[PDB]
Design an enzyme around this catalytic site. Sequence first.
Site, PDB file in Angstrom:
ATOM      1  N   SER A   1      -1.424  -0.440  -6.419  1.00  0.00           N
ATOM      2  CA  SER A   1      -1.486  -1.624  -7.253  1.00  0.00           C
ATOM      3  C   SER A   1      -0.922  -1.340  -8.638  1.00  0.00           C
ATOM      4  O   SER A   1      -0.762  -0.190  -9.054  1.00  0.00           O
ATOM      5  CB  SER A   1      -2.925  -2.112  -7.378  1.00  0.00           C
ATOM      6  OG  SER A   1      -3.575  -2.090  -6.122  1.00  0.00           O
TER       7      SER A   1
ATOM      8  N   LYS B   1     -16.761  -5.973  -6.825  1.00  0.00           N
ATOM      9  CA  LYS B   1     -16.029  -6.848  -7.739  1.00  0.00           C
ATOM     10  C   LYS B   1     -15.406  -8.034  -7.007  1.00  0.00           C
ATOM     11  O   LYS B   1     -15.472  -9.174  -7.485  1.00  0.00           O
ATOM     12  CB  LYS B   1     -14.958  -6.051  -8.479  1.00  0.00           C
ATOM     13  CG  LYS B   1     -14.578  -6.640  -9.817  1.00  0.00           C
ATOM     14  CD  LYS B   1     -13.757  -5.671 -10.634  1.00  0.00           C
ATOM     15  CE  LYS B   1     -13.537  -6.194 -12.038  1.00  0.00           C
ATOM     16  NZ  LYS B   1     -13.012  -5.138 -12.943  1.00  0.00           N
ATOM     17  N   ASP B   2     -14.828  -7.797  -5.828  1.00  0.00           N
ATOM     18  CA  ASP B   2     -14.279  -8.895  -5.046  1.00  0.00           C
ATOM     19  C   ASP B   2     -15.377  -9.745  -4.424  1.00  0.00           C
ATOM     20  O   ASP B   2     -15.173 -10.942  -4.213  1.00  0.00           O
ATOM     21  CB  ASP B   2     -13.337  -8.349  -3.977  1.00  0.00           C
ATOM     22  CG  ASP B   2     -12.080  -7.734  -4.570  1.00  0.00           C
ATOM     23  OD1 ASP B   2     -12.042  -7.523  -5.799  1.00  0.00           O
ATOM     24  OD2 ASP B   2     -11.136  -7.444  -3.809  1.00  0.00           O
TER      25      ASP B   2
ATOM     26  N   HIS C   1       0.800  -1.221   0.000  1.00  0.00           N
ATOM     27  CA  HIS C   1       0.000   0.000   0.000  1.00  0.00           C
ATOM     28  C   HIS C   1       0.835   1.275   0.000  1.00  0.00           C
ATOM     29  O   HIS C   1       0.263   2.363  -0.109  1.00  0.00           O
ATOM     30  CB  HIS C   1      -0.942   0.029   1.201  1.00  0.00           C
ATOM     31  CG  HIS C   1      -2.085  -0.927   1.087  1.00  0.00           C
ATOM     32  ND1 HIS C   1      -2.804  -1.095  -0.075  1.00  0.00           N
ATOM     33  CD2 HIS C   1      -2.673  -1.722   2.011  1.00  0.00           C
ATOM     34  CE1 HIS C   1      -3.746  -2.000   0.121  1.00  0.00           C
ATOM     35  NE2 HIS C   1      -3.702  -2.380   1.384  1.00  0.00           N
TER      36      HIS C   1
ATOM     37  N   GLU D   1       0.557 -34.435  -3.199  1.00  0.00           N
ATOM     38  CA  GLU D   1      -0.599 -33.836  -3.844  1.00  0.00           C
ATOM     39  C   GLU D   1      -0.169 -33.093  -5.108  1.00  0.00           C
ATOM     40  O   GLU D   1       1.021 -32.881  -5.360  1.00  0.00           O
ATOM     41  CB  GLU D   1      -1.329 -32.907  -2.882  1.00  0.00           C
ATOM     42  CG  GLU D   1      -2.152 -33.637  -1.843  1.00  0.00           C
ATOM     43  CD  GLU D   1      -3.367 -34.319  -2.445  1.00  0.00           C
ATOM     44  OE1 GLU D   1      -3.953 -33.763  -3.397  1.00  0.00           O
ATOM     45  OE2 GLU D   1      -3.739 -35.412  -1.969  1.00  0.00           O
TER      46      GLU D   1
HETATM   47  C1  HEM Z   1      -0.356 -16.354   1.071  1.00  0.00           C
HETATM   48  C2  HEM Z   1      -0.979 -16.067  -0.061  1.00  0.00           C
HETATM   49  C3  HEM Z   1      -1.061 -14.678  -0.531  1.00  0.00           C
HETATM   50  C4  HEM Z   1      -1.945 -13.744  -0.114  1.00  0.00           C
HETATM   51  C5  HEM Z   1      -3.016 -13.910   0.927  1.00  0.00           C
HETATM   52  C6  HEM Z   1      -1.672 -12.568  -0.835  1.00  0.00           C
HETATM   53  C7  HEM Z   1      -2.437 -11.432  -0.614  1.00  0.00           C
HETATM   54  C8  HEM Z   1      -2.379 -10.380  -1.485  1.00  0.00           C
HETATM   55  C9  HEM Z   1      -3.279  -9.314  -1.516  1.00  0.00           C
HETATM   56  C10 HEM Z   1      -4.466  -9.149  -0.608  1.00  0.00           C
HETATM   57  C11 HEM Z   1      -2.878  -8.483  -2.505  1.00  0.00           C
HETATM   58  C12 HEM Z   1      -3.569  -7.209  -2.888  1.00  0.00           C
HETATM   59  C13 HEM Z   1      -4.693  -7.514  -3.884  1.00  0.00           C
HETATM   60  C14 HEM Z   1      -4.134  -7.766  -5.256  1.00  0.00           C
HETATM   61  O1  HEM Z   1      -3.547  -6.883  -5.829  1.00  0.00           O
HETATM   62  O2  HEM Z   1      -4.282  -8.959  -5.844  1.00  0.00           O
HETATM   63  C15 HEM Z   1      -1.718  -9.025  -3.098  1.00  0.00           C
HETATM   64  C16 HEM Z   1      -1.017  -8.432  -4.130  1.00  0.00           C
HETATM   65  C17 HEM Z   1       0.237  -8.869  -4.546  1.00  0.00           C
HETATM   66  N1  HEM Z   1       0.847 -10.004  -4.189  1.00  0.00           N
HETATM   67 FE1  HEM Z   1       0.108 -11.364  -2.924  1.00  0.00          FE
HETATM   68  N2  HEM Z   1      -0.650 -12.753  -1.680  1.00  0.00           N
HETATM   69  C18 HEM Z   1      -0.227 -14.017  -1.559  1.00  0.00           C
HETATM   70  C19 HEM Z   1       0.791 -14.671  -2.242  1.00  0.00           C
HETATM   71  C20 HEM Z   1       1.685 -13.966  -3.018  1.00  0.00           C
HETATM   72  C21 HEM Z   1       2.844 -14.497  -3.566  1.00  0.00           C
HETATM   73  C22 HEM Z   1       3.273 -15.929  -3.393  1.00  0.00           C
HETATM   74  C23 HEM Z   1       3.463 -13.479  -4.272  1.00  0.00           C
HETATM   75  C24 HEM Z   1       4.737 -13.548  -5.007  1.00  0.00           C
HETATM   76  C25 HEM Z   1       4.885 -14.294  -6.092  1.00  0.00           C
HETATM   77  C26 HEM Z   1       2.649 -12.320  -4.142  1.00  0.00           C
HETATM   78  C27 HEM Z   1       2.959 -11.107  -4.706  1.00  0.00           C
HETATM   79  C28 HEM Z   1       2.021 -10.087  -4.794  1.00  0.00           C
HETATM   80  C29 HEM Z   1       2.211  -8.907  -5.620  1.00  0.00           C
HETATM   81  C30 HEM Z   1       3.421  -8.632  -6.458  1.00  0.00           C
HETATM   82  C31 HEM Z   1       1.112  -8.143  -5.482  1.00  0.00           C
HETATM   83  C32 HEM Z   1       0.895  -6.809  -6.155  1.00  0.00           C
HETATM   84  C33 HEM Z   1      -0.222  -6.812  -7.194  1.00  0.00           C
HETATM   85  C34 HEM Z   1       0.049  -5.793  -8.265  1.00  0.00           C
HETATM   86  O3  HEM Z   1       0.140  -4.496  -7.956  1.00  0.00           O
HETATM   87  O4  HEM Z   1       0.178  -6.152  -9.408  1.00  0.00           O
HETATM   88  N3  HEM Z   1       1.563 -12.656  -3.374  1.00  0.00           N
HETATM   89  N4  HEM Z   1      -1.433 -10.196  -2.444  1.00  0.00           N
END
Ligand code: HEM
Lengths: 102, 58, 52, 379, 49, 75, 74, 241
Positions: D204, D226-227, D200, D270
């Site tokens: 995004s 949307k979500d 944040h 799995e």
């Molecule tokens: C434990 C599971 C995960 C949760 C709960 C999680 C949660 C979130 C949430 C709530 C957001 C903001 C909403 C969105 O933009 O989609 C987000 C964005 C993001 N997450 Fe995760 N995430 C997870 C796994 C990961 C993993 C494994 C990566 C790395 C590969 C990652 C990298 C990112 C990135 C780079 C964003 C930025 C989105 C953008 O601006 O393009 N996340 N994540």
Amino acid sequence: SSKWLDGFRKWYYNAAGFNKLGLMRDDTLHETEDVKEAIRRLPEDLYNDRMFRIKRALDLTMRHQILPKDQWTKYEEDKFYLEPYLKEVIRERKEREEWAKK
Amino acid sequence: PTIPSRLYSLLFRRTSTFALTIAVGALFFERAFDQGADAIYEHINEGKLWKHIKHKYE
Amino acid sequence: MLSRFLGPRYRELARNWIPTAGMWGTVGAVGLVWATDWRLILDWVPYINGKF
Amino acid sequence: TNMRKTHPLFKIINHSFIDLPAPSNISSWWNFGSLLGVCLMVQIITGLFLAMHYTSDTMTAFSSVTHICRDVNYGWLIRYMHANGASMFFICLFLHVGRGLYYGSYTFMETWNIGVLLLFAVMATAFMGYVLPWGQMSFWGATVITNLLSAIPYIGTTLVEWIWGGFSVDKATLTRFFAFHFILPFIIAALAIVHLLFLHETGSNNPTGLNSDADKIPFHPYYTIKDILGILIMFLILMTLVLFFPDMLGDPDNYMPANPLNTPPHIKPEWYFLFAYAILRSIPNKLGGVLALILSILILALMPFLHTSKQRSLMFRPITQILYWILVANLLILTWIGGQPVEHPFIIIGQLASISYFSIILILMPISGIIEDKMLKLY
Amino acid sequence: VANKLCQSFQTFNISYSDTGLLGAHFVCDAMSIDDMVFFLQGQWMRLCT
Amino acid sequence: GAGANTWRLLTFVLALPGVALCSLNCWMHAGHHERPEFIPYHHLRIRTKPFAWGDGNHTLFHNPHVNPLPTGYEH
Amino acid sequence: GREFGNLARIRHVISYSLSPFEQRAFPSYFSKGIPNVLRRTRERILRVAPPFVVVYLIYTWGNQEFEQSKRKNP
Amino acid sequence: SDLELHPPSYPWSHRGLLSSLDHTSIRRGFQVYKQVCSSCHSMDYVAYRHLVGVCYTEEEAKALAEEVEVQDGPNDDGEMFMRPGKLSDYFPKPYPNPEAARAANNGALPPDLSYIVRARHGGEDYVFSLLTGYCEPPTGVSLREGLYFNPYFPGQAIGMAPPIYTEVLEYDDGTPATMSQVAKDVATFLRWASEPEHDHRKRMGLKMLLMMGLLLPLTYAMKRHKWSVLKSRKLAYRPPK
Ligand code: HEM
Ligand SMILES: CCCCCCCCCCCCCCCCCC(=O)OC[C@H](COP(=O)(O)OCCN)OC(=O)CCCCCCCCCCCCCCCCC
Ligand code: HEC
Ligand code: HEM
């Protein structure tokens, strides 16, 4: 280089697809410190044109639409407005780095 | 005085009346939807469920 | 120490907010008897008496 | 005056979900991130209702799970949504990482690294949870993958005796795996809080990759509903996967009791581990296989330093789009090969698949980026 | 005045032949704008309730 | 009320959901019992003329499983 | 910080919007939706599909070679 | 033999997505298991109270559990004692321990049949093909005495003698007890034993499908409303020149 490289450049310009969102080439450049400084050095007319083109592109990609084909940015009419500013910023950064080396 | 104007006015316009509409509709929807889905399920499985053959074994 | 609200304006506010708070209480009671499946009131209603 | 901006608890919720500026053009893929959080809560909630009846003892673990299914009111429902919610969690996780790779979201390096920490934690949590029901496949998969984790000379054997709590997998391993499986989702939830906090500060990303500060909208009411719609679609998929095909993704060999002298003809993890498994056995050396698994999962961490284009997204890069879809195809082939036994012609297909996977991520995508840079007359 | 939001505000009722515009108009700096809209709408709802 | 909108609402709320409900209800009722015992009363299954189509003894919408013939049922 | 009010600097841009309560939520759904779906899939199908085509080819060939390898040699 | 024959797909009554089990077939299959299969196979995870409301009534299952001796204990004098069974008792084990089962069955251990259609690839198709697929061994292969040739058993060497033939038991409801009918009934009963929640799961899935088919266009309509304020938006530009 004479016959098809320009033709392949035209075909690649059509294929990449930022022309059908109305964008120029230098609008698509991802910001760095250099690109942000080059954007900051732009005059007001080109800055306002760039920001309107960017938000028009974001409007079009919201609705999953494209511009009509006559409003696609032409390959020859595409101006490289930013890259002298970007090249000057890169040159002065390289000067600062080579001074910091010695 | 038309029906959609009065349906908005005395049911949808106030938020508390909106919530009362939602609660009463939820109760009646539960009863009607349970009856409909149970009837569909017993028709698809006609003679197969236990209640269809419960009368044979008293 | 609640003597700041002893006047005609707060009484006016109170009689303005009788029907909305009463209707919200009705919503809460109907939602409570709907979610709990309480047998006191749900036997007094015609259509919902089908599973009993 | 208003509580939305001045109350110290509602200020956080307003800053993160209500008046947060978000790009106006983000597609459905971004919904996957919120879906992941929802899956986490679902898993935690369902996990708690499995913990009110589960008995972590090797005599009474399989029996306790059968008692959950057969005697607990709606206990079959909770157990099978926990299993298929783990599967849906990994589906949403894979598509989240694919969104991060495609749209250049790894330039948020702190967010990317907290992400790969979250990915490691959820892989370990799903591993120990799969050990927990104490069937044939749980016992034998745990024994196989921990014994190959023991391959490090002079260090790995003491580490595997310390992990097992004994000579092999036994009741101590089952109980400590229960404790670790319970406690790891809360570190996962805290790390997701840190993930969102690191996001944040910068906002995004958008599919075009451009600066979306010219056109941004509040999170409420747009991305709220949307979500919500994405949550409803996910719950359709999950409840279809529980109420209609409850063991299509599962493995039948986990339904026998754990006999320590009954080695199954095939031993698999799995499905969401299987690709790494096929990178594991693609090298005929145990140190090489385990270290190659570590690189195959940590090449995501190496990814932000392998970016060469002056653009960010792949929306205007067709060659790197082709290489990305070849990479996804190769990942699908690796999953299928890891499902398959170690015979002809699966060994050579798996070897070429892992070689092409590492070659595409490491070598071919920066070459394609510099080729497209030269092709666009900027380099 | 207390929150230092406005530079000015002004309510209006504008009438033409069976139509008109009823509402408010304010000038302020950028950082205040959203807050005042909330406050302004709250005032209207108080007159509604 | 000088408006088509009340009839639009009345179609989309009373008419089409009502016909959908009775269609589903008739699908619940779509179970037919076995055929009656062939008792040949002379006040029905009469032939005062051979029929003008095909065999001369089959009706226009004849179905061989519920509709009898004056000779009897056919298999 | 990153709140509304100081995100960027836009000049000379006019935006027009309607209420959601007086425009349709599905304005010409099929008649304008089907051509854009065909346009999007025409733009992306040659980038996406042939890797999964050769996935299907390798899958079928691997299954056939496996069942041949389990078959003996008369 | 490394290659293995796969069972085909049989058109079961419960094969469809919304089709439940046939409870009369569950009743007949339980009679088959009690008369035949309970001599060597156990169903430790299924009790006599599980049959109530599925294929037997309360007094029927009460009598069927009362005709079973259960070793209760310990007594006040400190010993085990035989008692008549009750509805809370599970199905009785044929052997007190697996090694006695091995001793009575030529080394091979007869598996517990509570999850045996959830633990095999094919399920009730596999169980039907195993029970009805017994045949004389082909030439070349000469198996050991006391083993039996079954092409559906993996390895094609089963330690179970064929328990199914025509009129191996009777049926109280008047059904011809053929080989295939008994095998089909016991496969239906085994599917019920592995998944006692099967019919309730399919009913809840039908309610889920109807509710989701109602809810998805309405929530999509809410999204289209609150986003159609933005998707009809037009932008203009006023450069001063
Ligand atoms: C434990 C599971 C995960 C949760 C709960 C999680 C949660 C979130 C949430 C709530 C957001 C903001 C909403 C969105 O933009 O989609 C987000 C964005 C993001 N997450 Fe995760 N995430 C997870 C796994 C990961 C993993 C494994 C990566 C790395 C590969 C990652 C990298 C990112 C990135 C780079 C964003 C930025 C989105 C953008 O601006 O393009 N996340 N994540
Ligand atoms: C010069 C090309 C001209 C194409 C003309 C097509 C018809 C044009 C007129 C009709 C319009 C059709 C739709 C137009 C779509 C967009 C424009 C287009 O056609 O683009 C061509 C597309 C992308 O263009 P570009 O990136 O320049 O191609 C490089 C080729 N590699 O490129 C392609 O489609 C080619 C993609 C080839 C991909 C081959 C992948 C092979 C390897 C897969 C391995 C997978 C893993 C296997 C297992 C490994 C381990 C064993
Ligand atoms: C004593 C003669 C038995 C009778 C009566 C029944 N079964 Fe059996 N069964 C028995 C043994 C010794 C074995 C092990 C076979 C081996 O070679 O190991 C079995 C095995 C089974 C199996 C499992 C087969 C598999 O591939 O795992 C099943 C599904 C099975 N038997 C079914 C079954 C049924 C339905 C019976 C009642 C009609 C039955 N068996 C009776 C011993 C005996
Ligand atoms: C704090 C939260 C959690 C608790 C208390 C918990 C608890 C349990 C318990 C008791 C079991 C064994 C019962 C059973 O197998 O049906 C189990 C199984 C399992 N859990 Fe969790 N769990 C939690 C979170 C998670 C998460 C986040 C995942 C996903 C990564 C997960 C994946 C699994 C899997 C895959 C199984 C095996 C399912 C099977 O039997 O096939 N759990 N969990």
